Amino acid sequence: SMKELSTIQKREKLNTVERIGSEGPGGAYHEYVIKSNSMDSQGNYDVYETIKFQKGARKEEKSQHGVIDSDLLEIVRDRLKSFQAGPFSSRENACALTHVEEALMWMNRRVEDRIERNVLGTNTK
């Protein structure tokens, strides 16, 4: 099945984000589609992109390799840094960037804690 995400942005959205499939390992969904909101005059949706996540903890049998959430945030972190070094910097970009980095820091704190407890990549609290 598929459900569209309710996004924080409400107006002038370029793309919609769709959640594909059912809940899987960790309680998470593992496939998302980014799709143009509007069509051109020939009916084409210029953007139609699928992102598939790592599905199951990496050391567990039958897990499948994929993207991980920090990868996406690192890309947006780099984009925001570029925008701030470019001709159209803004305070909003500055604040978004700090929050994206703080998210990444919390995700990495989780990783390093799981390394310390020797549970990274396993289905263990």
Ligand X SMILES: Nc1ncnc2c1ncn2[C@@H]1O[C@@H]2COP(=O)(O)OP(=O)(O)OC[C@H]3O[C@@H](O[C@@H]1[C@@H]2O)[C@H](O)[C@@H]3O
Query: Given the rule CB under 6 A, which residues bind ligand X?
Result: 25-26, 28, 53-58, 69, 83, 88, 93, 107, 110, 114, 120-121, 123
- Assess 66 for contact with a second copy (CB under 8 A): yes
Q: What does the chain come to in residues?
A: 125
Which token pair is 56? 């199951």
DSSP string, 71-115: HHHHHHHHHHHHHHHSTT--HHHHHHHHHHHHHHHHHHHHHHHHH
Q: Nearer Cβ to ligand X, position 21 or 121?
A: 121
Residue 29 has, within 13 A of its CA and on its CB side, a CA count of: 16
Site for a second copy (CB under 8 A): which residue of 10, 41, 43, 62? 10
Q: How many Å is the Cα radius of gyration of the chain? A: 18
- Assess 113 for contact with a second copy (CB under 8 A): yes
What mask, x for binding a second copy by CB under 8 A, covers residues 79 to 98? xx-xx-xxxx-x-xx-xxx-
- Assess 20 for contact with a second copy (CB under 8 A): no
